Amino acid sequence: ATKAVAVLKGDGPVQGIINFEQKESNGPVKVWGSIKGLTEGLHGFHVHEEGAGHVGDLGNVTADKDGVADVSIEDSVISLSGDHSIIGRTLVVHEKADDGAGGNAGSRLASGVIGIAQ
Structure with missing residues (x-):
């Protein structure tokens, strides 16, 4: 793909939308959008492959x-x-600030499937 959209929801208040765009196959991805219902400050933001x-x-x-x-x-x-x-x-937003590639950002507040858009 060249654009994707993840729509994030949880069972609590956190919800939002994150967009991805990549103009070239080995080039960087632009990630943009907004998430609401969070406590002020930092929240871990991860991509999880199902199983992995x-x-x-x-x-x-x-x-x-x-x-x-x-x-x-x-x-x-x-x-x-x-x-x-x-x-x-699955894109995931967490309760606390990121603690690494494999460290603990606390529980998952909202998630959504990264879906093809273009």
Whole structure:
């Protein structure tokens, strides 16, 4: 793909939408959108492949005082095409700040499937 969209929800208040775009096959992915219903400050942001015991770390999103995290990053590590495409994987937002590729960001607050958009 060249664009993907994950719509995030949970059983609590956290919800949002994250968009991905990649103009070239080996080029960086632009990740942008917003997530609401979060406590102010940092929250772990990960891509999980179903089954796979490993995780794609996208760092932290930062919520403002109203609980709104606007997201806008470039990520050279993930891709929307090829052998390691994140298409179909689950995007996750966490309770606490990221603690690594394999460390504990606490529980999952919302998630959604990264779906092809273009």
